[model samples]
Target: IRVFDVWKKYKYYKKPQDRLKEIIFRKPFHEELWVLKGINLEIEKGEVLGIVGPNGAGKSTLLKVITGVTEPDKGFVERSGKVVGLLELGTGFNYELSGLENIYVNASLLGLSRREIDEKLESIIEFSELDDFINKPLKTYSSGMIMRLAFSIAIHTEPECFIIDEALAVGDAHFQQKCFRKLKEHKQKGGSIIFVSHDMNAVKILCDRAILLHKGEIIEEGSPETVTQAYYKLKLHH
Candidate 1:
């Protein structure tokens, strides 16, 4: 699958201070902003690609388009897989629902039947190590617990393509290590993954191919060594 000159734009409603002298004096106000500008990429099976960029460089936005969560303003996104995206900290989970209930809700969104969720239930619980807390509301769980449950639920779907943002940084080191190892195993079993992270060391260890995004457009795409050096060299020069 590929993105052909994809672009994304956002419209923001002006608040009272948005166009007021107080704000406009401090910063120039643009009515609309382009977050992504003509991004292009080709993704193949079993490819573990990493996306790295500054805070507002549109890494997450691109991931959303790739996963069909949002449409690009211009150009096209083409894919051929059952794509699953993990964007938010713990998306599709309700604070009011118990861990077990949230599992069912997520499964339903993925088009799984109740019976399928039932079959996967035991394994999910075991993987999250939430056996004791499964019956409690999600609001009561720690951030680590929430991530553990969310990650376990996401992986159990057996998607052909997995798109992850920075959501995986929540869990402890051991769980993070387990997920990373399992990600490799997922690729070994023919699954494709796209990861966005800021931890350069983790990127060096985990990525096979990577792209460096700046502002909105892709500045470079190559082996991690080349891209990382290019980014750092330019950063230091500035």
Candidate 2:
């Protein structure tokens, strides 16, 4: 997967100031907030690349563009394989749907046929550890439960490249360890992983390389420890 010269921005205006100005002036009145600016990156097969930054630093925005959930304002992104993204907490599920129902729905959206989902249904449910709640409505489930279900479906879909946000941190420590093991196995099988997190330990352990984003630019990129330290240094200076 490759991202070249990618740029994304948003326009915003305060409520009271924008209304009267827009009506009277009949002109544009908003500030341009660039979330990403000329980002160039590439991830090879079997590589785990970590993205680290402070809150609102465009880390999630970059993943959104890479996963096609959000479009870039300029430039382009290239993806070569089946890309699956875990962008938000409990995304792509119906609140009214039961866990079992959601498994089918989510898997189907990820390109699995009904028959294929059926073949993998047992393993998916087992991985999620929601046997008792599988028949209950998703709205009744806890955030951790919902995250487990979503993670199970995503991994079971056999993605060639996986993009994950901070959602992974919702799981318990044991479950987080389990997910890390799964990620290791995925990489051993030649799958690419793009991860975003604030946990420096996890990044250092799982990522072959890491990038530090400040504001909307890549300030540093290298080994996980090197970039992580640089990120901390930047935060202190700020």
Candidate 3:
């Protein structure tokens, strides 16, 4: 997967008048927020790349661009294989669907055929550990339970590359450890991963390389430890 000179921005209209003015006058009545700025990066199979940043530093936006969840305002992403993305907690899931049913929904969303979803169903359930609650609606599950189901469904899609954006942050430490081991196994099987998170420990342990993003740009890129140190320094300044 490759990201080439990607940029994204948003316009926020603060008040009712602001929105009305833009509609009435054909003028810019909104404040612009640049969420990504000329980001260029690449990941090869069997590699794990981490993105660490403060809140609103473009981490999620970049992941979204890479995953095709959103388009970049400038430049492009070249995705060469099946890429499954686990985005924001509440974004990719169906609230009315039961946990077991949601696996079909999510896997199908990721390009799995119904037959494929059927074959992978039991393993996804076992991995999630939702057991009896698998019959419960997604709205009834805790945030952590939702993460479990989301992660399980996503990984079962058997993606060539996986993009995760802060979805793992809600999981407990024990589950996080399981996720880490699972990621390592994925990497060994020639899968690439892009992980975006605020957790420095997970970044250091899982990533072969890391990027420090701030103010819509990458400030540093290097070994996980080096980039995470830069992240902390920027945190203090904030």
Candidate 4:
């Protein structure tokens, strides 16, 4: 996956009148916020790259652009092979659906045929450890349960690349370790990964390369240790 000179911005209005005025006057009453400015990056097969930044630093925005969930206002993003993305806490599952039903729903959305899902069905249920509640409505499950289901479907889909953003943090320590092991296995099989996290330790351990972002720009990019050090120093300075 590659992002070249990508830029994204948003307009915020302080009051209802501001928005109305902007609409009426053809756009001048709102404040402009640049979430990503001239961003350029790439992810290679079998590589794990980590992105670290404070809140609103554009890490999630960058992932969304790469995953094609959102478009950049400028430049372009190019991707190859099958990619699966896990964003934050919520999986896009129907709340009224049962856990078993949601597996088929979410996995099908990721491009798996019903037959393919049937084959992987048991394994996914077992990995999620939600078999007892598999027949219950998704809204009844906890956040960790939802994350488990999402991650299980993602791994089972056999994606060539993954774009993950802080989804693992919602799981228990054991599940987090299990997920990391799965990621390592995926890396061994030549799958590329882009991980976004505030956990400096996980970033250092899992990423071959890392980048630090501050206010929509890349502050540094290098070995995880180097980038992490700069990130910490920046935090301290602030």
Maximum-TM-score candidate: 2
Q: How much is 181 displaced in model 2, in angstroms?
A: 2.3
For model 4, residues 1-238, the per-residue Cα lDDT tens digits are: 8889999989878897887887788869988888999798888899989999988798878878887779899999888866777652235589898888887767767778989988988887898888789999999999778877777788767787877776544658888777778888889998898888888998998789999998898999989999999998899988
Q: What tens digits encode model 2's per-residue C-alpha lDDT throughout 1-238?
A: 8999999999778676795798789887777889998799988999989999987778878888877788889999988766787553345689799989887777776778889988888888898889989999999999879888888888767777888776554658887777778878898898998878888998898789999987878999999989999988998997
Task: List TM-scores for all candidates, in order.
Answer: 0.83, 0.86, 0.81, 0.85
Q: What is the C-alpha local distance difference test score of each model?
A: 0.80, 0.83, 0.80, 0.82
In model 4, where do residues sit more than 4 Å from their true spots?
A: 23-27, 88-90, 139-143, 232-238
- What ranges in model 1 sit over 4 Å off? 12-30
| Each model's total of backbone clashes | 0, 0, 0, 0
The window of 10 residues in a row where model 4 has the poorest summed lDDT is 83-92
lDDT tens digits by residue: candidate 3, 126-200: 888889999999999997788777777776566778776665445577877777677778888988988877788
Residue pairs with colliding backbones in model 3 are none
Candidate 3 versus truth, CA RMSD in Å, comes to 3.1
Error of 3 at 54 (Å): 3.1
